[PDB]
Nucleic acid binder design. Sequence first.
RNA 1: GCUCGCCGGAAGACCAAGGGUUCCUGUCCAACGUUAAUCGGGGCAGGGUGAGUCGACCCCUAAGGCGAGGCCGAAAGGCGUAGUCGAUGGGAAACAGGUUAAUAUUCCUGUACUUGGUGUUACUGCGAAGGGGGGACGGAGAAGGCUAUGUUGGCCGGGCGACGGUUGUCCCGGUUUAAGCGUGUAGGCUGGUUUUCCAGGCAAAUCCGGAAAAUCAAGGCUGAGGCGUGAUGACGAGGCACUACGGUGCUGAAGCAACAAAUGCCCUGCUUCCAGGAAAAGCCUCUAAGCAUCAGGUAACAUCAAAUCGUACCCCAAACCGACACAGGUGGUCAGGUAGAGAAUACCAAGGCGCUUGAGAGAACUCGGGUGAAGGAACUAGGCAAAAUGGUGCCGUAACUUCGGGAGAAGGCACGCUGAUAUGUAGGUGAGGUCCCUCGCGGAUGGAGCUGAAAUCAGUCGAAGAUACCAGCUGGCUGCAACUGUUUAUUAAAAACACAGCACUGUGCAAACACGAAAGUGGACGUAUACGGUGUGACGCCUGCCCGGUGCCGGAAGGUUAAUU
RNA 2: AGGACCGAACCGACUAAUGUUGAAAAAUUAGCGGAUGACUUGUGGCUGGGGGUGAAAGGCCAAUCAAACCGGGAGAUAGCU
Lengths: 93, 271, 46
Amino acid sequence: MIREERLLKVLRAPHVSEKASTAMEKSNTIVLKVAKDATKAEIKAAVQKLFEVEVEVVNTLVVKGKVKRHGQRIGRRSDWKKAYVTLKEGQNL
Amino acid sequence: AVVKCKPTSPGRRHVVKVVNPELHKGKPFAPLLEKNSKSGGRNNNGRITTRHIGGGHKQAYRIVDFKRNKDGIPAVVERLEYDPNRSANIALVLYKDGERRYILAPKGLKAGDQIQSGVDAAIKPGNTLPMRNIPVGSTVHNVEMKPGKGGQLARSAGTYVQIVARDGAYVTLRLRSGEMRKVEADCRATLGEVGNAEHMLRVLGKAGAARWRGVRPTVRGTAMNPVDHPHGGGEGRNFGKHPVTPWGVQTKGKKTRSNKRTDKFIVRRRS
Amino acid sequence: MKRTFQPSVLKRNRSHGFRARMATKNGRQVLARRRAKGRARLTVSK
RNA sequence: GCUCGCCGGAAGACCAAGGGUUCCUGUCCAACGUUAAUCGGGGCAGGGUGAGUCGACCCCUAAGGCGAGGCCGAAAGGCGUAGUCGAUGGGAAACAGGUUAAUAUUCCUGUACUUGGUGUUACUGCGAAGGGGGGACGGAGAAGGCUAUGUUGGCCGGGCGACGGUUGUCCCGGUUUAAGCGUGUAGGCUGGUUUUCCAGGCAAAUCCGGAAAAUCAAGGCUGAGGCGUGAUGACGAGGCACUACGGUGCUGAAGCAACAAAUGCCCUGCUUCCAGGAAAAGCCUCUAAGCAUCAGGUAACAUCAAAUCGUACCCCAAACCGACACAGGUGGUCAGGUAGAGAAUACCAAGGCGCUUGAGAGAACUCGGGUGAAGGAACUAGGCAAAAUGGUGCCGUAACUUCGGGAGAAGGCACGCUGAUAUGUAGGUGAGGUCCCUCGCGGAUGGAGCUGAAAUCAGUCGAAGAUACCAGCUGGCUGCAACUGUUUAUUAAAAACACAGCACUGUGCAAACACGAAAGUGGACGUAUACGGUGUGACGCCUGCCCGGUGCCGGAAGGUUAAUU
RNA sequence: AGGACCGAACCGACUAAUGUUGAAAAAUUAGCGGAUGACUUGUGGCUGGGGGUGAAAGGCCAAUCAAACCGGGAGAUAGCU
Ligand SMILES: [Mg+2]
Ligand SMILES: [Mg+2]
Ligand SMILES: [Mg+2]
Ligand SMILES: [Mg+2]
Ligand SMILES: [Mg+2]
Ligand SMILES: [Mg+2]
Ligand SMILES: [Mg+2]
Ligand SMILES: [Mg+2]
Ligand SMILES: [Mg+2]
Ligand SMILES: [Mg+2]
Ligand SMILES: [Mg+2]
Ligand SMILES: [Mg+2]
Ligand SMILES: [Mg+2]
Ligand SMILES: [Mg+2]
Ligand SMILES: [Mg+2]
Ligand SMILES: [Mg+2]
Ligand SMILES: [Mg+2]
Ligand SMILES: [Mg+2]
Ligand SMILES: [Mg+2]
Ligand SMILES: [Mg+2]
Ligand SMILES: [Mg+2]
Ligand SMILES: [Mg+2]
Ligand SMILES: [Mg+2]
Ligand SMILES: [Mg+2]
Ligand SMILES: [Mg+2]
Ligand SMILES: [Mg+2]
Ligand SMILES: [Mg+2]
Ligand SMILES: [Mg+2]
Ligand SMILES: [Mg+2]
Ligand SMILES: [Mg+2]
Ligand SMILES: [Mg+2]
Ligand SMILES: [Mg+2]
Ligand SMILES: [Mg+2]
Ligand SMILES: [Mg+2]
Ligand SMILES: [Mg+2]
Ligand SMILES: [Mg+2]
Ligand SMILES: [Mg+2]
Ligand SMILES: [Mg+2]
Ligand SMILES: [Mg+2]
Ligand SMILES: [Mg+2]
Ligand SMILES: [Mg+2]
Ligand SMILES: [Mg+2]
Ligand SMILES: [Mg+2]
Ligand SMILES: [Mg+2]
Ligand SMILES: [Mg+2]
Ligand SMILES: [Mg+2]
Ligand SMILES: [Mg+2]
Ligand SMILES: [Mg+2]
Ligand SMILES: [Mg+2]
Ligand SMILES: [Mg+2]
Ligand SMILES: [Mg+2]
């Protein structure tokens, strides 16, 4: 079993965009910004516990940060991971 | 047999083939095969240490029994086979107990013949005996140098050794080179001479034929610059030198044998 | 016209990478020299 | 938006490498873009990459690397055993439809499949670091059976024509459907089963190999495609409605047959040749120690798990390698129509483009092309360049020759369209029907329909019928090199190099020889019919005299002669 | 059958013209050679500088080759400009 500390610090933020909203309306899916090293099992456990819902499956992908220039110097935003969490068609956060 | 090709192209005009109908047509005996990769004449430093080697056809190694120490059990010849790794043909033999082995095929051997090794084997082609038990004057092949080590002399197609004398613990052999040599009488030899004696009548016919055997071209020294070979240089065709190897040693007549350890056994050099 | 630089990441890492440097005394001297110079990218890995 | 032009074995569509946000949306035009720019691969902000089955990761090895001990070496280090890494190779599993501005074999719908762990039940000899099988392998060639695919017919929907005609033998469009599951076909290979014995497989083995009997002769393995199902589903021309004009929502006909047909599949097959064609695991099987009414194995069912990383976009290119938005380079896959032998070539389809300065004018001269009176190599170092020849079928073809060639020698004739032979022939394919049997994806007969050359005869048009594109100039004498090949990347492709063949010479195996302070390694898991060096250079006829000089080989009496004493 | 023949892809590079501050630090256009083999090509590997490799041209070894490149001895030496 995963300890509650890990579950408390694997979720970071809910992703907000047009694709995320469409997924919520049509596929009953929430899109989350999660820790870079969280696994699908950890994400599923954390969603089931901290939001008290039932999840079918988790899809994950790593988003690479963009190279940017801020007044003549080149930076790079950090990579982050996002999860597509499919709920069990009765929960509706 | 020896077959001259029809001159239907310039590369075929001079080809002479050696065709043996008796040889097997199928795949060889898998349990007695292993892989040998090619070297290109390179040693373990990665450097060319023998020149004119490279390419050619892929080959597999046939484990050939040179010891012939399965004593007392008769064996029967099943089939003659082509061996890529040597000029002689090999014969697959079946021992009465169910073991199969490859041996060098002697002249006259054919499928169905009986062979045997040991001190009491009959004096027949293909039978291996210690040279103590072989009559003086016999022609043998696949001769050992040290007892129990495996045959080392007269293994190529058409070659044989003649037992000339028996003096005590040693026999005196006449090797194909013409050299008279002594070996211990306890070393074994196979009666009769190696088969495929027409192997030297073949004519490759074209340059590609030699490339198929893994032989690369030879550049004459007199065709190089002086920095490459002692023979190089000249305006036009010039020699004015005593012929030497690429490393400067005289190459027409100078003797290179230097082995005081084994001179006791050489009765007479090949002359 | 085939030019001389034909990129391949595997060969680049196997020839000039950090682990190829650390495999020999002379490679480790290369790394020591570059650390002394203060290079910001020590090998081709970065 | 309409019209015009260009590519279409690519200038279209995918994958690998490589690049890394160039992808999509909004906004901006200073700089960048060889001009303007409202545009952009530019600036700025935001969005976007979803996997048990695809790839990596993972199991297994190749060349090769590293390498405990070890051997060797002033030091540094070198080699290498047991091992352990290393793909460009072997190893389980998913398809069709739909959807976003941007991802989809990943999301959704439908239908599947693989491996492993647990639990229950039933049966039960399980067990490896070991044995055996298998995996597992070349080049060429020849078919036969198929499919992808196309064409035509039928069917369904629509049409009746801007100018003579067009209710028809007329015109346009559509006519699609997977994996899986069942069937085990065309065809390929192989005799099967039982018993007994055994110097073999490091021990054992019931497994493999070998031997001997008995008996049966049909049993096993592999296998494209078709057919059924998947699928009463999906898709579907088109029609109807809203459009916030990009498109959104709602329905939905027919969905068949014949013929032609691959370079794809059966096929890792078959035939043949010599130059004789990876490894290891997964997998099947056998036992050893060991365990023993346990563990373990087999089968059914249930349940759980299948993580992590990649996934946008370019990819013959403005995004990769060339300093450039550079006429260059860059591996693999797909492969429509008409003509054609064809992946050539011409015109087109799907699809994509008009190459990021224009507008005028119509001088010399330069570049790239067209034609040319009469002449026809007079040009020039030289027919350099250009012009010319050019297809298929048939007739015909010299010296010389190594008997294969020379030879496509040279030279010549026919060639379009229409009709008939013959309402479409020879041939190919082949339905219904009939009859058999081991009732089947069967055999024999039968021939409807479909497809269909080539030839002859007659007519006919033009200056010309291989009409375009495409597509040998030919012959005579001679030097050199036998020949196919190779070479001065970037002024030399040759007569130079190589070559098959020839000779000499070294080498008896711990070979000579080469790399190496060495250990070692190559030669070679080869053994004088072998290997190294040197010269010559197919083949034919041949290869003469000189051993004084310089080398090399042999000799060992005498003279001279080192360290040493 | 064949280092057989004609001929695309593919691999080359014989002739000519153009270009020569190029579109290009070796190309383009029209022709040309091989095109089942001593063929060609992808991926990975090995050989290292008096060394490699070379069907041999002193060719090639990162646009560098009768001795690569980088750093050091090094401010070499220069009866010469
Ligand atoms: Mg899913
Ligand atoms: Mg993923
Ligand atoms: Mg040689
Ligand atoms: Mg030779
Ligand atoms: Mg020369
Ligand atoms: Mg010299
Ligand atoms: Mg001369
Ligand atoms: Mg002279
Ligand atoms: Mg066109
Ligand atoms: Mg950017
Ligand atoms: Mg864009
Ligand atoms: Mg302006
Ligand atoms: Mg501008
Ligand atoms: Mg932009
Ligand atoms: Mg290894
Ligand atoms: Mg050690
Ligand atoms: Mg080592
Ligand atoms: Mg491994
Ligand atoms: Mg691979
Ligand atoms: Mg896309
Ligand atoms: Mg079909
Ligand atoms: Mg082909
Ligand atoms: Mg994509
Ligand atoms: Mg441009
Ligand atoms: Mg370009
Ligand atoms: Mg290419
Ligand atoms: Mg074309
Ligand atoms: Mg003009
Ligand atoms: Mg002109
Ligand atoms: Mg004229
Ligand atoms: Mg005229
Ligand atoms: Mg004339
Ligand atoms: Mg003249
Ligand atoms: Mg004149
Ligand atoms: Mg000309
Ligand atoms: Mg012309
Ligand atoms: Mg002359
Ligand atoms: Mg020649
Ligand atoms: Mg040149
Ligand atoms: Mg040239
Ligand atoms: Mg040795
Ligand atoms: Mg010569
Ligand atoms: Mg040819
Ligand atoms: Mg050209
Ligand atoms: Mg030719
Ligand atoms: Mg040709
Ligand atoms: Mg020279
Ligand atoms: Mg260079
Ligand atoms: Mg020097
Ligand atoms: Mg000094
Ligand atoms: Mg100075």
